[PDB]
């Protein structure tokens, strides 16, 4: 069965059985608490086909995470503005971060992934050798003890939450190895089904491909687990259109060079093959 | 429609479709990565009936968590020995904790729930006002902003892992409110289907009941999410006996007085009603 039907059944389930629920943005949602889907990574890549996904944004964002950046400007210069609103002067001031330079998202993914527990100052501070490099520790463990049931990268950092422009939606992920296959499970505390979720699925599918390549393993499964899975009210019509389209076979992901360390990946090393999505569907971002 | 069928279906799924997988204890397992079940908390309590669950241990352990204890002795004195091995002189030394008193589990659940980010010294240290009191913060947010999609309690603390006798199996949990009902999702990175999982299900169902009480809400769902869900090889025959038993209706949990703060709950304030499970099934703990 086509993996994308799981995403579609979830959207359908929220539309039929979800409850109306207010939210921080004042937009309102239809919401379900607790969902799980499994996307095979074996000779296919779960880039959704019922709408075109901004794949370039996914790849640049992840490389930006990996090099430890929490500066939206360093991502916007690549032509990816998905974090620009959250780092804007007006939104930062909206949370009391008046002394903060524009673009500074606070101690979010890049900082927690490479520097968990270090003392956060500025997005451009030097943090070399500070905190826990969870990304490299996950990589080292997969190589030396693939049976380990503790292979976790955690972005949720209660001590640092008050400094984040947006507390991470992807609280943590866990990796798992059996039969030479590398699987990943993401715990997403909050999922915008129309905008973020398709993006996030591709993001962690890519991360698994990158780490599988670095560790000499094959991609297995990506398990997507949701807390508050919601459809914003102004996404109902677009998503009702999207459910009527039929999915096309998932594209493939090719890695064009042999890479030795996670840090050496560059955009040019990746190529999506056979991606024939339905047209884009515009959906406004609740801020 | 009996909630326990979900647990029995998962055990069956691992027995049928799980993979052989080596593990830290050297026992070996049949393993599946990524599972989810939903246990209703509405006028029933998911204490499994196809074998007797050690309800006293569930209750004492949670009260021991809530008051912030990391002292296995303080639990063993109540006649609950589930953590004694992990605090034993020999197991501590097996991890290099030669200077530590017996019973000192390190910065595990109780400390992370009440003092996340504090500098751990010994089990007996005074930590009042140090670190983030995630437990009380969860309660405060549920009362003042029940729509919040960030109601999380996280025990996974990458900076403290090297000090823990056992890194937590319950990495984090999230709370959710809709329609006057309080729900909880547990992310459990590793699940011993035979021993811990039935216990753990009761534990977070109980935690949800306690918080629903102090927040003036009704219990909703407990969503149980597993990473490495496994059956130890020496639990297969015991579990195959359990799978042939048919569930009895779940008991009820009563809270016998109005309690105002999570810290004021006491063992005597709880009563399990109508619990007549099938006989106990002996299953050795892989250590
Ligand atoms: C992960 N992420 C970061 C967070 C930031 N805030 C936010 N707020 C809300 N309420 N829902 C969300 O999910 C997100 N996502 C994304 C943000 C925006 C997009 C996005 O804007 N996608 C467009 C394309 C944009 C473009 O092409 O430049 C689309 O596919 O329709 C994608 C991810
Ligand atoms: C959550 N938990 C803590 C962890 C500790 N280590 C561990 N190791 C393994 N490999 N599987 C597990 O799951 C657990 N569980 C429990 C630990 C032990 C038990 C237990 O076995 N108690 C006995 C004594 C009680 C009595 O006799 O009445 C019993 O249930 O019969 C139950 C939960
Ligand atoms: O779905 C999302 N994926 C993200 N990846 O980085 C980031 C955000 N979101 C969604 C989740 C919420 O709809 C919203 C975050 O708001 P919050 O749950 O109140 O924190 O954006
Ligand atoms: O299922 C469990 N529930 C627990 N609650 O506190 C604690 C432990 N376990 C199980 C999971 C593993 O079989 C084992 C822990 O070993 P580890 O996953 O290698 O850390 O005990």
Q: How many residues does chain B have?
A: 287
Q: How close is the Cα of B212 to the center of ligand 4, in Å? A: 27
How deeply is A76 buried, as exposed, middle or buried, from its count of CB atoms within 10 A (0-12, 13-18, 19+)? middle
8 Å CB contact between A246 and A201: no
Helices (H), chain B: 4-17, 55-66, 72-76, 89-94, 109-115, 134-144, 196-214, 236-243
Pairing of strands A270-273, B19-21: unpaired
Residues with Cβ within 8 Å of residue A269, at least 6 apart in sequence: A255, A256, A257, A259
Q: Which residues pair with B178 in a beta bridge?
A: B181
Interface test with B, best of A34, A38, A148, A163 (most B CBs within 10 A): A34
Q: Which strand (E) or helix (H) includes residue A108?
A: none
Query: Given ligand 4 and candidates A141, A147, A149, which is best to mutate, with the most ligand atoms within 8 Å of its CB?
Result: A149
8 Å CB contact between A187 and A150: no
Which has the closest alpha carbon to A34: B223, B84, B43, B40?
B223
- Extract the tokens encoding A126: 């030097």
Distance spanning both ends of chain B, measured CA to CA: 35
Domains in chain A: boundaries: 1-287
Q: How close is the Cα of A90 to the center of ligand 3, in Å? A: 19
A26 lines ligand 3 (CB under 6 A): no
| Measured distance CA(B228)–CA(B18) in Å, rounded | 10
Name the maximum alpha-carbon separation found in chain A. Answer: 52
| Measured distance CA(A221)–CA(A49) in Å, rounded | 19
| Measured distance CA(A279)–CA(B162) in Å, rounded | 50
Which residue has the least CA distance to atom 22 on ligand 2?
Answer: B82
Number of other CB atoms surrounding residue B26 within 10 Å: 8
- Extract the tokens encoding A241: 């259109």
| Measured distance CA(A11)–CA(A18) in Å, rounded | 10
| Measured distance CA(A198)–CA(A44) in Å, rounded | 16
Residues with Cβ within 8 Å of residue A136, at least 6 apart in sequence: A114, A262
Residue A286 in marked binding region: yes
Indicate which residues of A carry an active-site annotation.
Answer: 169
Residue B179 in marked binding region: no
- Extract the tokens encoding A158: 């209660």
| Measured distance CA(B176)–CA(A29) in Å, rounded | 14
- Any idea what DSSP says for residue B163? G
Which has the closest alpha carbon to A169: A215, A256, A91, A109?
A109
Which has the closest alpha carbon to A200: A19, A77, A12, A57?
A57
* Phi, psi (rounded to 5 degrees) for A13: -65, -40
Nearest ligand by distance to the CA of B145? 3
Check the CA dihedral A221-A222-A225-A231 and report its sign: negative
3-class secondary-structure state, position B227: strand
Which residue has the least CA distance to atom 21 on ligand 4?
Answer: B192
| Measured distance CA(B27)–CA(B25) in Å, rounded | 5
Residue B127 in marked binding region: no
A196-215 helix and A55-66 helix, angle to the nearest 10 degrees = 60
CA dist A96 to A69, A122, A163, B137, B149, Å? 22, 15, 10, 20, 20
8 Å CB contact between A177 and A217: yes
| Measured distance CA(A256)–CA(A270) in Å, rounded | 6
Pairing of strands B181-192, B252-255: unpaired
- Any idea what DSSP says for residue B23? -
| Measured distance CA(B111)–CA(A117) in Å, rounded | 16
8 Å CB contact between B31 and B228: yes
| Measured distance CA(B29)–CA(B23) in Å, rounded | 7
Which has the closest alpha carbon to B183: B222, B224, B225?
B222
- Extract the tokens encoding B1: 């429609």
Q: How many residues does chain A have?
A: 287
In chain A, residues with a C-beta closer than 8 Å to the C-beta of B140 are none
8 Å CB contact between A225 and B225: yes
B24 lines ligand 4 (CB under 6 A): yes
Q: Which residues of A204-220 are buried (b: 16+ CB within 10 A; e: fewer)?
A: bbbbbbbbbbbbebebb
8 Å CB contact between A62 and A207: yes
Number of other CB atoms surrounding residue A249 within 10 Å: 13
Which residue has the least CA distance to atom 15 on ligand 2?
Answer: B196
Which has the closest alpha carbon to A205: A40, A9, A69?
A40
- Extract the tokens encoding B111: 């400390």
Superfamily (CATH) of domain B1-287:
Thymidylate synthase/dCMP hydroxymethylase domain (3.30.572.10)
Q: What is the 3-state secondary structure (H, E, C) of A46-103?
A: CCCCCCCCCHHHHHHHHHHHHCCCCEHHHHHCCCCCCCCHHHCHHHHHHCCCCCCCCC
Across the interface, which of B134, B147, B150 has its CB nearest the CB of A21?
B147
Q: Which residues pair with A254 in a beta bridge?
A: A271
| Measured distance CA(A232)–CA(A283) in Å, rounded | 10
Number of other CB atoms surrounding residue A273 within 10 Å: 9
- Extract the tokens encoding B224: 């149980």
8 Å CB contact between B45 and B273: no
| Measured distance CA(A22)–CA(A13) in Å, rounded | 18
| Measured distance CA(B242)–CA(B193) in Å, rounded | 12
CA atoms within 13 A on the CB side of B157: 32
8 Å CB contact between A3 and A40: yes
| Measured distance CA(B204)–CA(B185) in Å, rounded | 9
Resolution in A: 2.1
Task: State the structure-solving technique.
Answer: X-ray
Radius of gyration over alpha carbons of chain B, in Å?
19
Interface test with B, best of A33, A145, A223 (most B CBs within 10 A): A33
Q: How close is the Cα of A91 to the center of ligand 1, in Å? A: 16
In chain A, residues with a C-beta closer than 8 Å to the C-beta of B176 are 33, 227-228
In DSSP notation, A109-152 reads HHHHHHHBTSPP--TTS--TT-SB-HHHHHHHHHHH-TT-S--E
Query: Which segments of chain B are extended strands (E)?
Result: 19-21, 29-40, 152-154, 170-178, 181-192, 218-232, 252-255, 270-273
């Amino acid at each position: 069965r086509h993996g994308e039907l799981q995403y579609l059944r979830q959207v359908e389930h929220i539309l039929r059985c979800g409850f109306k629920k207010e939210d921080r943005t004042g937009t309102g949602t239809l919401s379900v608490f607790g969902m799980q889907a499994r996307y095979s990574l074996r000779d296919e890549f779960p880039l959704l086909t019922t709408k075109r996904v901004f794949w370039k944004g996914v790849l640049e964002e992840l490389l930006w995470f990996i090099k430890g950046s929490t500066n939206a400007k360093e991502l916007s210069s690549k032509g990816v503005r998905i974090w620009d609103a959250n780092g804007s002067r007006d939104f930062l001031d909206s949370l009391g971060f008046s002394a903060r330079q524009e673009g500074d998202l606070g101690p979010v993914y890049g900082f927690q992934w490479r520097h968990f527990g270090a003392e956060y100052k500025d997005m451009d501070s030097d943090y070399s050798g500070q905190g826990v490099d969870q990304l490299q520790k996950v990589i080292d463990t997969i190589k030396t003890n693939p049976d380990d049931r503790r292979i976790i990268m955690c972005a949720w950092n209660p001590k640092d939450l008050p400094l984040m422009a947006l507390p991470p939606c992807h609280a943590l992920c866990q990796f798992y190895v059996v039969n030479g296959e590398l699987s990943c499970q993401l715990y997403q505390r909050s999922g915008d089904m129309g905008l973020g979720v398709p993006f996030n699925i591709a993001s962690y599918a890519l991360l698994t491909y990158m780490i599988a390549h670095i560790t000499g393993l094959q991609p297995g499964d990506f398990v997507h687990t949701l807390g508050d899975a919601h459809i914003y009210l102004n996404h109902i019509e677009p998503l009702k259109i999207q459910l009527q389209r039929e999915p096309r076979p998932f594209p493939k992901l090719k890695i064009l060079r042999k890479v030795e360390t996670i840090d050496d990946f560059k955009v040019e090393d990746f190529q999506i093959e056979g991606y024939n999505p339905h047209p884009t569907i515009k959906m406004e971002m609740a801020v």
